[PDB]
Amino acid sequence: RFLLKDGQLWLCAPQAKQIWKCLAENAVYLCDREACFKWYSKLMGDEPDLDPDINKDFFESNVLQLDPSLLTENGMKCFERFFKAVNCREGKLVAKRRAYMMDDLELIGLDYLWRVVIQSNDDIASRAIDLLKEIYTNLGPRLQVNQVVIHEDFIQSCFDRLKASYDTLCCARQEAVRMVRVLTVLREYINECDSSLHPRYISFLWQVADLGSSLNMPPLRDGARVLMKLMPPDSTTIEKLRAICLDHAKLDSLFFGPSASQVLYLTEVVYALLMPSSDFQFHFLKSGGLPLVLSMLTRNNFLPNADMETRRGAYLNALKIAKLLLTAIGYGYMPDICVIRAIQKIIWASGCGSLQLVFSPNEEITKIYEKTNAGNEPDLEDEQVCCEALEVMTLCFALIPTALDALSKEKAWQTFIIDLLLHCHSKTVRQVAQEQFFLMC
């Protein structure tokens, strides 16, 4: 390296092979590969030393032929510079100031840069995604009129890769990472776009989230849900609900679709429309709004095939709509006792961290309360599941004053306040528990 620093010599391809092919490509110890990777990283630093004709030769000859499964962090910065230097020399990219911004689309290295992220460990995939977002999102002149063409082409390609990866499950844990990473490609991709139109993009994604609970893969649901949330509401779905609401103004199956996850997204859509759109509240309450929200909360077959976060995610969203429904109708009767028994049962398990037991005989929920190994801590999201649940209970009791009168007699509605004020934890829930008990008083 030091000899080839100021001697003005060009590292010819023949000797470039033997230092490459026979040294690290066929090695024994991992440090042997580490040595060659970093040595290349400094060698091509900011100025070529093999001359561009060899640079376009040996990088595309066997450097790209390296197995992505055996590649480390040092393999990234050399690989990135190869993408930057080789592409900008032929006229496929431009260095510009720092970021080698896009000029062509059929890049010589994009063929296996997808392979690098699809088949690697956690750190390598992140860097590969970092490079994909760096090149794809950053677009400049001479294609600046073609955002739709480039962005849609990128989106459809991943969806095809997602769909191709999807059908394999129907190595299962390995392919599960493939969906996680290909979605991981998608999520930061749209991040720089801000700084979709196809209904199929969510319809397929609906089944994707359900498959996450089919094998109980946590990040799959997380990946799909974050992707949907960081995605402006689907045009087809938003018009469909208001059309049926308008149709019923002059729907039960809409929110009770057999697919589990799509219920969560549809509930998310309505609440987003309701909160700041002024007319949708009137249409929703008129057709079936308040009767449905209580029915979907008081029923056991609301989502029989529900994962832990899916059902509570269905809950935490549903109760949010129940707020503005009751407040609007407050200025001026379906609510009854059976509705409350569910809502109290929601908070029962919610402050226990055991919403899965929200269909328990209610004696078990007491049992975990009395210092059961200190393992009933509510999650940072179970805290809300209690919070908007309590305030809804206050609004309903304002509508029906006599309902709370009968509740004092039973054993329930006595241990309920004791648990929510003494045996509960994570004070913020207990803060609203007492405070909302005061308003009803």
Coordinates of C-alpha atoms in Angstrom, one line a residue:
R1 CA 0.0 0.0 0.0
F2 CA 2.7 2.5 1.0
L3 CA 4.7 1.6 -2.1
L4 CA 1.6 2.4 -4.2
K5 CA 1.1 5.8 -2.7
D6 CA 3.2 8.3 -4.7
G7 CA 5.0 6.0 -7.2
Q8 CA 2.5 6.9 -10.0
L9 CA 2.2 3.2 -10.9
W10 CA -1.0 1.6 -12.0
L11 CA -1.9 -1.8 -10.4
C12 CA -2.3 -3.9 -13.5
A13 CA -5.1 -6.5 -13.6
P14 CA -2.9 -9.7 -13.6
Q15 CA -1.2 -9.0 -10.3
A16 CA -4.5 -7.5 -9.1
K17 CA -5.9 -11.0 -9.5
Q18 CA -3.3 -13.0 -7.5
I19 CA -3.5 -10.5 -4.6
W20 CA -7.3 -10.9 -4.8
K21 CA -8.2 -14.4 -6.0
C22 CA -5.6 -16.4 -4.1
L23 CA -5.4 -14.3 -0.9
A24 CA -8.9 -13.7 0.5
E25 CA -11.3 -15.3 -1.9
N26 CA -9.9 -18.7 -0.9
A27 CA -8.8 -18.2 2.7
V28 CA -9.1 -20.0 6.0
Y29 CA -9.2 -17.4 8.8
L30 CA -11.7 -14.5 8.7
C31 CA -9.0 -11.9 9.4
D32 CA -7.5 -12.8 6.0
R33 CA -10.7 -11.5 4.3
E34 CA -10.7 -8.6 6.8
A35 CA -7.2 -7.6 5.7
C36 CA -8.0 -7.6 2.0
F37 CA -11.3 -5.7 2.4
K38 CA -9.7 -2.8 4.3
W39 CA -6.6 -2.8 2.1
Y40 CA -9.0 -2.3 -0.9
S41 CA -10.9 0.4 1.1
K42 CA -7.8 2.6 1.4
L43 CA -6.4 1.7 -2.0
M44 CA -9.3 3.1 -4.0
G45 CA -9.7 6.0 -1.6
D46 CA -10.8 9.1 -3.5
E47 CA -8.6 8.3 -6.5
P48 CA -8.1 5.2 -8.6
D49 CA -4.9 3.2 -8.6
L50 CA -5.8 0.3 -10.9
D51 CA -6.9 2.6 -13.8
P52 CA -10.6 2.8 -14.7
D53 CA -10.5 0.1 -17.5
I54 CA -9.2 -2.4 -14.9
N55 CA -11.6 -0.9 -12.3
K56 CA -14.6 -1.7 -14.5
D57 CA -13.0 -5.1 -15.1
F58 CA -12.0 -6.7 -11.8
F59 CA -14.8 -5.3 -9.7
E60 CA -17.4 -6.7 -12.2
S61 CA -15.3 -9.9 -12.8
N62 CA -14.9 -11.5 -9.4
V63 CA -15.4 -8.8 -6.7
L64 CA -19.1 -8.9 -7.5
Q65 CA -18.8 -12.7 -7.7
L66 CA -18.1 -12.7 -3.9
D67 CA -20.7 -14.6 -1.9
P68 CA -22.9 -12.0 -0.1
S69 CA -23.5 -14.5 2.7
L70 CA -19.8 -14.2 3.7
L71 CA -19.2 -10.5 3.8
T72 CA -18.5 -8.1 6.7
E73 CA -18.6 -4.4 7.4
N74 CA -15.3 -3.8 5.8
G75 CA -16.8 -5.3 2.7
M76 CA -19.3 -2.4 2.6
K77 CA -17.2 0.7 2.2
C78 CA -15.1 -0.9 -0.5
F79 CA -18.2 -2.1 -2.2
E80 CA -19.9 1.3 -1.9
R81 CA -16.8 3.1 -3.4
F82 CA -16.8 0.6 -6.3
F83 CA -20.5 1.5 -7.0
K84 CA -19.6 5.2 -6.8
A85 CA -16.3 5.1 -8.8
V86 CA -17.2 2.5 -11.5
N87 CA -20.6 3.9 -12.3
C88 CA -19.5 7.6 -12.5
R89 CA -16.6 6.7 -14.9
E90 CA -18.7 5.2 -17.7
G91 CA -21.2 8.0 -17.4
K92 CA -23.9 6.1 -15.4
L93 CA -23.7 8.4 -12.3
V94 CA -22.1 11.7 -11.2
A95 CA -20.1 12.4 -8.1
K96 CA -21.5 15.9 -7.7
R97 CA -20.5 17.3 -4.3
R98 CA -20.5 14.2 -2.1
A99 CA -23.5 12.0 -3.0
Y100 CA -23.0 10.2 -6.3
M101 CA -26.4 11.1 -7.5
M102 CA -28.3 9.2 -10.2
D103 CA -27.8 9.4 -13.9
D104 CA -28.7 5.9 -15.2
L105 CA -31.1 3.3 -14.0
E106 CA -29.7 -0.1 -15.1
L107 CA -26.7 0.2 -12.8
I108 CA -24.1 -2.5 -13.1
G109 CA -24.2 -3.2 -9.4
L110 CA -27.9 -3.1 -8.6
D111 CA -28.2 -6.7 -9.8
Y112 CA -26.7 -8.1 -6.5
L113 CA -27.1 -5.1 -4.2
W114 CA -30.6 -6.6 -3.8
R115 CA -28.9 -10.0 -3.3
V116 CA -26.6 -8.4 -0.6
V117 CA -29.5 -7.1 1.4
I118 CA -31.7 -10.2 0.8
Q119 CA -28.9 -12.6 1.9
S120 CA -26.8 -11.3 4.8
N121 CA -26.7 -10.7 8.5
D122 CA -28.4 -7.7 10.2
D123 CA -25.6 -5.1 9.9
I124 CA -24.9 -5.7 6.2
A125 CA -28.6 -5.5 5.2
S126 CA -28.9 -2.1 6.9
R127 CA -25.9 -0.7 5.0
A128 CA -27.2 -2.2 1.8
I129 CA -30.6 -0.5 2.4
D130 CA -28.7 2.7 3.3
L131 CA -27.0 2.5 -0.1
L132 CA -30.3 1.7 -1.9
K133 CA -32.0 4.7 -0.4
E134 CA -29.0 6.9 -1.1
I135 CA -29.1 6.1 -4.8
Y136 CA -32.8 5.6 -5.5
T137 CA -34.2 8.5 -3.5
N138 CA -31.6 11.0 -4.7
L139 CA -32.6 12.0 -8.2
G140 CA -31.4 15.1 -10.1
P141 CA -31.5 16.6 -13.6
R142 CA -32.2 14.8 -17.0
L143 CA -34.6 12.5 -15.2
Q144 CA -36.3 15.0 -12.9
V145 CA -39.5 14.9 -14.9
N146 CA -39.8 11.1 -14.3
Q147 CA -40.4 10.7 -10.6
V148 CA -43.5 8.6 -11.3
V149 CA -41.7 6.3 -13.6
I150 CA -38.7 5.7 -11.3
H151 CA -40.6 5.5 -8.0
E152 CA -43.4 3.3 -9.3
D153 CA -40.8 0.9 -10.9
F154 CA -39.0 0.7 -7.6
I155 CA -42.2 0.0 -5.6
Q156 CA -43.6 -2.7 -8.0
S157 CA -40.2 -4.5 -8.0
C158 CA -40.2 -4.9 -4.2
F159 CA -43.8 -6.0 -4.2
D160 CA -43.0 -8.6 -6.8
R161 CA -40.1 -9.7 -4.6
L162 CA -42.4 -9.6 -1.6
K163 CA -45.0 -11.6 -3.4
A164 CA -42.4 -14.1 -4.6
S165 CA -41.0 -14.3 -1.1
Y166 CA -44.6 -14.5 0.3
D167 CA -45.6 -17.8 -1.4
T168 CA -42.6 -19.7 -0.1
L169 CA -44.0 -19.8 3.5
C170 CA -47.4 -21.1 2.4
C171 CA -35.7 -21.8 6.1
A172 CA -39.1 -20.4 7.1
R173 CA -37.5 -18.2 9.7
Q174 CA -34.8 -17.2 7.2
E175 CA -37.4 -16.2 4.6
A176 CA -39.2 -14.3 7.4
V177 CA -36.2 -12.1 7.5
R178 CA -36.4 -11.6 3.7
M179 CA -39.9 -10.1 4.0
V180 CA -38.7 -8.0 7.0
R181 CA -35.7 -6.6 5.0
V182 CA -37.6 -6.1 1.8
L183 CA -40.2 -4.1 3.8
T184 CA -37.3 -2.4 5.5
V185 CA -36.2 -1.3 2.1
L186 CA -39.7 0.2 1.5
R187 CA -40.1 2.1 4.7
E188 CA -37.0 4.3 4.6
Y189 CA -37.6 4.6 0.8
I190 CA -40.7 6.6 1.4
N191 CA -39.0 8.5 4.3
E192 CA -36.8 10.5 2.0
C193 CA -39.6 10.9 -0.5
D194 CA -41.6 13.0 1.9
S195 CA -38.5 15.1 2.8
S196 CA -49.7 4.1 -2.7
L197 CA -52.2 4.8 -5.4
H198 CA -52.7 1.1 -6.3
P199 CA -55.3 -0.5 -4.0
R200 CA -53.5 -3.8 -4.5
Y201 CA -50.5 -2.4 -2.6
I202 CA -52.5 -2.6 0.6
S203 CA -54.8 -5.5 -0.3
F204 CA -51.7 -7.7 -0.6
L205 CA -50.2 -6.0 2.4
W206 CA -53.3 -6.8 4.4
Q207 CA -52.7 -10.5 4.0
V208 CA -49.0 -9.9 4.7
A209 CA -49.8 -8.6 8.2
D210 CA -52.1 -11.5 8.9
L211 CA -49.3 -14.0 7.9
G212 CA -47.1 -12.3 10.5
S213 CA -49.4 -13.7 13.2
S214 CA -49.9 -17.0 11.3
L215 CA -46.4 -18.1 12.3
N216 CA -46.2 -15.5 15.1
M217 CA -43.5 -13.3 13.5
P218 CA -43.4 -10.0 15.5
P219 CA -41.6 -7.7 13.0
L220 CA -43.8 -8.7 10.1
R221 CA -46.9 -7.1 11.7
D222 CA -44.7 -4.2 12.8
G223 CA -43.3 -3.8 9.3
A224 CA -46.7 -3.9 7.7
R225 CA -48.5 -1.6 10.2
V226 CA -45.7 1.0 10.2
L227 CA -45.7 0.9 6.4
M228 CA -49.5 1.4 6.3
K229 CA -49.4 4.2 8.8
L230 CA -46.5 6.0 7.0
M231 CA -48.7 5.9 3.9
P232 CA -51.4 8.5 3.0
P233 CA -54.9 6.9 3.3
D234 CA -55.9 4.6 0.4
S235 CA -58.2 6.4 -2.0
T236 CA -60.3 3.3 -2.7
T237 CA -60.9 2.5 1.0
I238 CA -61.7 6.1 2.1
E239 CA -64.4 6.5 -0.6
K240 CA -65.8 3.1 -0.1
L241 CA -66.6 3.6 3.6
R242 CA -68.2 7.0 3.0
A243 CA -70.2 5.6 0.0
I244 CA -71.7 2.9 2.2
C245 CA -72.2 5.4 5.0
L246 CA -73.9 7.7 2.4
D247 CA -75.7 4.6 1.0
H248 CA -77.0 3.8 4.5
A249 CA -77.7 7.5 5.1
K250 CA -80.3 7.5 2.3
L251 CA -71.5 -1.9 6.7
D252 CA -71.4 -4.5 9.4
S253 CA -69.3 -6.8 7.2
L254 CA -67.1 -3.8 6.3
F255 CA -65.6 -3.7 9.8
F256 CA -66.1 -7.4 10.4
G257 CA -64.0 -8.8 7.5
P258 CA -62.6 -12.2 8.1
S259 CA -59.1 -10.9 7.6
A260 CA -57.8 -9.8 11.0
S261 CA -55.3 -7.0 10.2
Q262 CA -57.5 -5.3 7.6
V263 CA -60.0 -4.5 10.4
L264 CA -57.2 -2.6 12.2
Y265 CA -56.4 -0.5 9.1
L266 CA -60.1 0.3 8.3
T267 CA -60.6 1.5 11.9
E268 CA -57.4 3.6 11.5
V269 CA -58.8 5.1 8.4
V270 CA -62.2 6.2 9.9
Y271 CA -60.6 7.7 13.0
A272 CA -58.1 9.6 10.8
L273 CA -61.0 10.9 8.8
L274 CA -63.0 11.8 11.9
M275 CA -60.3 13.7 13.7
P276 CA -58.7 16.8 12.1
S277 CA -64.1 15.7 7.4
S278 CA -66.9 17.5 9.2
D279 CA -69.6 15.6 7.4
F280 CA -68.2 12.1 7.9
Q281 CA -69.1 12.2 11.6
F282 CA -72.8 12.8 10.8
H283 CA -72.9 10.1 8.2
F284 CA -71.1 7.5 10.5
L285 CA -73.2 8.1 13.6
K286 CA -76.4 8.2 11.5
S287 CA -76.0 4.8 9.7
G288 CA -74.5 2.5 12.4
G289 CA -71.8 4.3 14.2
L290 CA -72.5 4.1 18.0
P291 CA -74.4 0.7 17.8
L292 CA -71.5 -0.8 15.9
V293 CA -68.6 0.4 18.2
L294 CA -70.4 -1.1 21.3
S295 CA -71.2 -4.3 19.4
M296 CA -67.7 -4.8 18.2
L297 CA -66.4 -4.4 21.8
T298 CA -69.0 -6.5 23.5
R299 CA -68.6 -9.5 21.2
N300 CA -66.3 -12.5 21.6
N301 CA -66.2 -13.3 17.9
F302 CA -65.0 -9.8 17.1
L303 CA -61.7 -11.3 16.1
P304 CA -61.3 -15.0 17.1
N305 CA -58.0 -15.4 15.3
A306 CA -56.3 -12.4 16.9
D307 CA -52.7 -11.9 18.0
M308 CA -51.8 -10.0 21.1
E309 CA -51.1 -6.7 19.5
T310 CA -53.7 -7.1 16.8
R311 CA -56.7 -7.4 19.1
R312 CA -55.6 -4.6 21.4
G313 CA -54.7 -2.6 18.3
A314 CA -58.3 -3.3 17.3
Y315 CA -59.4 -2.2 20.7
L316 CA -57.3 0.9 21.2
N317 CA -58.4 2.3 17.9
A318 CA -62.1 1.4 18.3
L319 CA -62.5 3.1 21.7
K320 CA -60.9 6.3 20.2
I321 CA -63.9 6.7 17.8
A322 CA -66.2 5.9 20.8
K323 CA -65.1 9.2 22.4
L324 CA -66.2 11.7 19.7
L325 CA -69.3 9.6 19.0
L326 CA -70.5 10.0 22.6
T327 CA -69.4 13.7 22.9
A328 CA -71.4 14.6 19.8
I329 CA -74.4 12.7 20.9
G330 CA -74.1 14.1 24.4
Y331 CA -75.7 17.3 23.4
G332 CA -79.2 15.9 23.3
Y333 CA -79.6 6.3 24.4
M334 CA -78.7 2.8 23.1
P335 CA -75.9 2.5 25.7
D336 CA -76.8 0.1 28.5
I337 CA -75.3 -2.0 31.3
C338 CA -74.0 -4.8 29.0
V339 CA -71.8 -2.3 27.2
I340 CA -70.1 -1.3 30.5
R341 CA -69.4 -4.8 31.6
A342 CA -67.1 -5.2 28.6
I343 CA -65.5 -1.8 28.9
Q344 CA -64.7 -2.4 32.6
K345 CA -63.5 -5.9 31.6
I346 CA -61.2 -4.2 29.0
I347 CA -59.5 -2.0 31.7
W348 CA -59.4 -5.0 34.0
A349 CA -57.0 -6.9 31.8
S350 CA -55.4 -3.8 30.2
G351 CA -53.9 -2.6 33.5
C352 CA -52.9 -6.2 34.1
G353 CA -50.9 -6.5 30.9
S354 CA -53.1 -9.5 30.1
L355 CA -55.6 -8.3 27.5
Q356 CA -55.6 -11.8 26.2
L357 CA -57.5 -12.6 29.3
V358 CA -60.3 -10.0 28.6
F359 CA -62.6 -13.0 28.2
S360 CA -61.7 -14.5 31.6
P361 CA -64.2 -15.2 34.4
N362 CA -62.7 -12.1 35.9
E363 CA -61.4 -14.0 39.0
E364 CA -58.1 -14.7 37.3
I365 CA -57.5 -11.0 36.5
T366 CA -57.8 -10.4 40.3
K367 CA -55.2 -13.1 40.9
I368 CA -52.4 -11.6 38.9
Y369 CA -53.2 -8.2 40.6
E370 CA -52.1 -9.3 44.1
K371 CA -48.3 -9.1 43.5
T372 CA -48.0 -12.1 41.1
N373 CA -44.2 -12.1 40.6
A374 CA -44.3 -8.4 39.6
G375 CA -45.1 -9.5 36.0
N376 CA -48.3 -7.6 35.4
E377 CA -46.6 -4.3 34.2
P378 CA -48.7 -2.8 31.4
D379 CA -46.9 -2.0 28.2
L380 CA -46.4 1.6 27.0
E381 CA -49.4 1.0 24.7
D382 CA -51.5 -0.9 27.3
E383 CA -51.4 2.4 29.2
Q384 CA -53.6 4.1 26.7
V385 CA -55.8 1.0 26.3
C386 CA -56.8 1.8 29.9
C387 CA -56.7 5.6 29.4
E388 CA -59.3 6.2 26.6
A389 CA -61.2 3.2 28.0
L390 CA -61.8 5.0 31.3
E391 CA -62.8 8.3 29.8
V392 CA -65.3 6.5 27.5
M393 CA -66.8 5.0 30.6
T394 CA -67.4 8.5 32.0
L395 CA -69.1 9.7 28.9
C396 CA -71.5 6.7 28.8
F397 CA -72.4 7.1 32.5
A398 CA -73.3 10.7 31.7
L399 CA -75.8 9.4 29.2
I400 CA -77.2 6.7 31.5
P401 CA -77.0 7.9 35.2
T402 CA -78.8 5.0 36.8
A403 CA -76.5 2.4 35.4
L404 CA -73.7 3.2 37.9
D405 CA -76.3 3.0 40.7
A406 CA -76.8 -0.7 40.3
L407 CA -73.1 -1.5 40.0
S408 CA -72.3 -0.8 43.6
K409 CA -74.2 -3.9 44.8
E410 CA -72.2 -6.6 43.0
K411 CA -68.7 -7.8 43.9
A412 CA -67.6 -6.4 40.6
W413 CA -67.4 -2.6 40.4
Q414 CA -65.9 -2.9 43.9
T415 CA -62.7 -4.8 43.3
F416 CA -62.6 -2.8 40.0
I417 CA -61.9 0.5 41.7
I418 CA -59.6 -1.1 44.3
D419 CA -57.5 -2.8 41.6
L420 CA -57.3 0.4 39.4
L421 CA -56.2 2.5 42.3
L422 CA -54.2 0.3 44.6
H423 CA -53.1 -2.9 43.0
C424 CA -52.3 -1.3 39.6
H425 CA -48.9 0.1 38.6
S426 CA -47.5 2.7 36.1
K427 CA -49.1 5.6 38.0
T428 CA -50.2 7.5 34.8
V429 CA -53.0 5.0 34.5
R430 CA -53.9 5.3 38.2
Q431 CA -53.8 9.1 37.7
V432 CA -56.7 9.0 35.2
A433 CA -58.3 6.1 37.1
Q434 CA -59.0 8.3 40.1
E435 CA -59.6 11.4 38.1
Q436 CA -62.2 9.9 35.9
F437 CA -63.8 8.2 38.9
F438 CA -64.3 11.8 40.3
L439 CA -66.2 13.1 37.2
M440 CA -68.8 10.3 37.4
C441 CA -69.1 11.0 41.1

